[PDB]
Amino acid sequence: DCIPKWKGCVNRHGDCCEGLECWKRRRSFEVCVPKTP
Amino acid sequence: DCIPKWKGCVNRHGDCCEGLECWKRRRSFEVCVPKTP
Amino acid sequence: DCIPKWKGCVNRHGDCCEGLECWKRRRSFEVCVPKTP
Amino acid sequence: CFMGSLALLALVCTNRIQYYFLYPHVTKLDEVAATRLTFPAVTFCNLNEFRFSRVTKNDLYHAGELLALLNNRYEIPDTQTADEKQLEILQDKANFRNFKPKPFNMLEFYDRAGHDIREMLLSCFFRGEQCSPEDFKVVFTRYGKCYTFNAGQDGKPRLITMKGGTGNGLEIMLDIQQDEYLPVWGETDETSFEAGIKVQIHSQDEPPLIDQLGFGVAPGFQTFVSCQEQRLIYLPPPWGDCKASEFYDTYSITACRIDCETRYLVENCNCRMVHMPGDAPYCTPEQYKECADPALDFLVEKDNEYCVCEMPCNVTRYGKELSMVKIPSKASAKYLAKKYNKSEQYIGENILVLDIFFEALNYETIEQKKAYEVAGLLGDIGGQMGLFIGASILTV
Amino acid sequence: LCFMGSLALLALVCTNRIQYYFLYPHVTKLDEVAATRLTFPAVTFCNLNEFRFSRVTKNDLYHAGELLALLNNRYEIPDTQTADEKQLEILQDKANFRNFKPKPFNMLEFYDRAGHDIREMLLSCFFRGEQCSPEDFKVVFTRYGKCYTFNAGQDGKPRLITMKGGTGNGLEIMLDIQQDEYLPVWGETDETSFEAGIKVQIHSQDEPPLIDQLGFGVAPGFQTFVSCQEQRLIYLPPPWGDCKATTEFYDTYSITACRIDCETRYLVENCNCRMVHMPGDAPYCTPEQYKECADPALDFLVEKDNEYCVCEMPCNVTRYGKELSMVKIPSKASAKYLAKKYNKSEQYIGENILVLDIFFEALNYETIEQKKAYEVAGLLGDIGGQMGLFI
Amino acid sequence: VVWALCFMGSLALLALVCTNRIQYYFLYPHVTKLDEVAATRLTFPAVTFCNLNEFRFSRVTKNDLYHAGELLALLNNRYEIPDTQTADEKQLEILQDKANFRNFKPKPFNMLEFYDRAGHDIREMLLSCFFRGEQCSPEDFKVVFTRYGKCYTFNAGQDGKPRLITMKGGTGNGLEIMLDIQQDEYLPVWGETDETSFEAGIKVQIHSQDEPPLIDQLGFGVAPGFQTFVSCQEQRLIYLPPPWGDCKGDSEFYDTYSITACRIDCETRYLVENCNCRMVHMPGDAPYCTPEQYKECADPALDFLVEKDNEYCVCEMPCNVTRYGKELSMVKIPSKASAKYLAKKYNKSEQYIGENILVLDIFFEALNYETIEQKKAYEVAGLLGDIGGQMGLFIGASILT
Ligand SMILES: *[C@@H]1O[C@H](CO)[C@@H](O)[C@H](O)[C@H]1NC(C)=O
Ligand SMILES: *[C@@H]1O[C@H](CO)[C@@H](O)[C@H](O)[C@H]1NC(C)=O
Ligand SMILES: *[C@@H]1O[C@H](CO)[C@@H](O)[C@H](O)[C@H]1NC(C)=O
């Protein structure tokens, strides 16, 4: 279930793997992405 | 009759009080305004 | 027949006089023009 | 020989001393690229002042004449030039039979009847970070109710950018809402022939004079704005003419003007306009027409005696470079129409996209430095003297 | 030996600072300030369309019909015509030369009369709250035809100034380009245009307008804002630099003046005539001369020839940093109002009405000047003293 | 016993008034000389331009729609035409017959090939071109791949051709293009991806020959229905390397060092070590990303790196920068009159001409060449001048003792 790096987290903003965030892209769909400070 | 400072001098370009001019505004109607050199 | 300086060389790109070229103008028709290096 | 040398020294030094006295100034230049860049404040305003659907009967009663929607006798002008559909809606609103005027406040009118950032903002990003209407600080100006991105006043830290390009800058998609534009039946300071928005890029600590120093952005185009931050530093007298207030925290030519405009408009009308600082009673719609607007217009466009603003010792200028592309494309039109429940024609007349960013070279500084300071004065001369002395000694 | 030894060492260094002198070095001082008073520049603008369709008479169509691509080489309406059947009739009755006697024709007169009238285009004008009239615009002829110059500052009128920044203290024009008066485009010539709108150039009073080469554009249906910044550059004449001072056609030396000069002489010694927009006192080229000599010779000189004209660098240059921006006009609301105010259709207003705001910003005056790096005084400072010491 | 104090009094003033100028030397100060002149000859810059639309609708084949259909938002995750489609019933039919994969065998597919073939053709877009009265052809444009897809570069100057020059200011001595953006060839936009665009027109970038185009980040825009004028001014900046400055080529992917080159470099390495592939527009020699790789790795990883990551790539300042001050302006096209003429000349409708035709004039003004260069303020030469002048006194006193 856990969504990996660079993957689509649409309708699942909280299903990202450890160290990831559901990032809304400026030109496309949401993507699980390495969390940054 | 004499039109005071900052007032509408429409159709009355010569009815301004002493020291005033009928000034046509860039965006609105004419206004009696302190004459300047 | 030989087309002189500054003249229309339309449909005749090779009928220019000695030392001339059929030059296509940016805004108008072709013109026989002094050849340049 | 010793005598000659002495003369030479003399020749050298008096002049040197004088040079030191003229208060000369070298202007050092430096155009580099900063690793970090403090992104500027972006204030933007809609050309239309009041939403047609928010103007109530009471509002039309108090400020109807000001908006040229009513004549001097609380009636709908015969010179009206609107369709028969807005005429009916506007006539039922201008019906004051058995109507009791409730209290009215301009600042409230602008705030409520103004354009809502929450309806205009269809999209917003700043470095991939999505932003909301809550990132825009409401600021009042001559155009009415405007907004400021990265205002940085209020307890929030001012945003920064460390890379060039659109990807690391502001990107807005607005809906100017022409369907909400007030009918223009006359020419006033509150009416506009144009549609779109007015924008100004300025330092956080510089109030926006958006009506005078702003640039324009039109609907139906995506506008790109390549910027370059330029910081200028001047020297105070004896070296220069600059200097390092009451209404504002930092000194600005704009701040100085806003100041003068306020005092002037106050001592002429006994009131201030909605967008002005200080603590004076806000001008009424009537006061606007007969005192406020006239007095202000004159002060700005005609008067050059009242306000005397000195040159700031610190100026932040942003070199802007605009460009645009059509929107929407013949293809993406029917898509945008469905996404926002608007007609295809509407999208073309109302939708707007603005990209504000920096280029590679982003930070230039033009600073006035003290050309000849005490140090070098006592040094070069001093050194020369020493040399002279040594020479003498040798001669001896 | 040790005294005559450092002597031959300070005799090679004594002639060292002088080497830097015969170098004629130059420091370039910069200064970007805000002037209390600012001499507002000249604003020359031209309509992209050259001749009004309603002003072209039968005689005009006869003399310059071929030049405007409205007629073929045989005084007939080209079969390649691409106009509606309403202008075709009006144009055919005008191209009817049966029992017609050609009256004299003059290009300069044609441009002047058939050109666009500032009195019809100018719907509004202000400069610092001061309303201005067509009489403030000085007629100037250029490649585009009959143009105009605000604040020309010639004829003895004093050049206007501005002391504050912002639109409120600058020029604001509202034009009507009159597309309904645009000549039908049936061919591609130097007198035809695919574009609609105007061409503008902001230049110093004493710098002739080369508006076709160095101008910017303004389109209809938009209010254009132009934030300007005056930049004055000063160069040094040789031995220090490559520039020169004042120049015979023009009063002050300008790269443009130099080019206008060359273009004129060249076009004259090639066609025995000058184009309407050129200085000097040569016979004005006829419509026929334009097509077969004037235009070609000029186009070639400008776009192809790089040997004839050799313009030196001016010692004094005034540059205006321009920054453009625009907003749509009219708004869906103010459309029906502007339509009634000018007795035009709503669609017309959108295709023809135009607003231009030219002004300065806060920082308005920048100077880049070449100063003599090492003057005589400095030279004196070192060499003599050294010599004395040597002695 | 006084001579010893005339020697100590001589040595003293030597170092005393000498150490004051050596500290200013080890400061490594730098003067920034300015010079805004007009060059007799001017090396006209490279002009890279790209169409906002990536793939021609008429060039997308059944096989292409199969491999990259999902990427273009023309298909869902199940090889079907999305129900959220928002196109007319005329393109729907043509697109459905193309999305019919019943009894279809997928042929091999390559992205680089797709961009190259399905991209926009300079030979169809270029309706006109001149550079100083010299007429130019599509063969003057060098094909360059970038994020927008298949772009082009006028006066590219690499490859064996000499870089063009200009010796006069004005439109007459600059580039003038008339393009046909071909909106009728624009891909239907049914979703929001990195390969879809709401806007129509082109994106342009004016850059030095030896500076790779980062056109998606640093480019400007040109819209259809307008003739755009661009008055340029070449600005050359020179910086000093350290001990004087912070500036400084690895020659890994590119010949000359550029902030852009540095970024293109980082983007490539990053995207490679994250997806095991590179995007069509990237240097190096890695396997080109597949349409699937784009959606699930390539695009995301790149977008993040550029818009969100500020740790990975650390580009130093170049010692040589060429900047072009641009000044834009436009006029409508066509005029109500020349419309019906342009319509016939290109066999298009009058409405089409207004939505698709474009004219771009790139040139220089009178003042065209400005230089901002960092010079070594205090060199060794001048240093030994004043410090050396104090030696003549220490040597004359060293003899008397
Ligand atoms: C210039 O002003 C800015 C505020 O915008 C300030 O941060 C900076 O310290 C000032 N510089 C100087 C030299 O005062
Ligand atoms: C779409 O727009 C129509 C008419 O403008 C409106 O009546 C309707 O409520 C809208 N639909 C939705 C789902 O908001
Ligand atoms: C530069 O030229 C202007 C005329 O435009 C003149 O007023 C000024 O005196 C000149 N400056 C110098 C240093 O010659």
Ligand SMILES: *[C@@H]1O[C@H](CO)[C@@H](O)[C@H](O)[C@H]1NC(C)=O
């Ligand atoms: C208004 O325009 C019409 C048609 O263009 C014209 O016939 C009429 O004379 C105009 N009316 C006025 C009052 O000028």
Ligand SMILES: *[C@@H]1O[C@H](CO)[C@@H](O)[C@H](O)[C@H]1NC(C)=O
């Ligand atoms: C700056 O770079 C250019 C290449 O674009 C080169 O021709 C020139 O020699 C360089 N200048 C210096 C001082 O290195």
Ligand SMILES: *[C@@H]1O[C@H](CO)[C@@H](O)[C@H](O)[C@H]1NC(C)=O
């Ligand atoms: C002109 O366009 C039509 C329809 O677009 C096309 O069928 C025809 O082949 C074209 N004519 C020529 C001569 O190319």
Ligand SMILES: [Cl-]
């Ligand atoms: Cl990057």
Ligand SMILES: [K+]
């Ligand atoms: K990129």
Ligand SMILES: [K+]
């Ligand atoms: K500069």
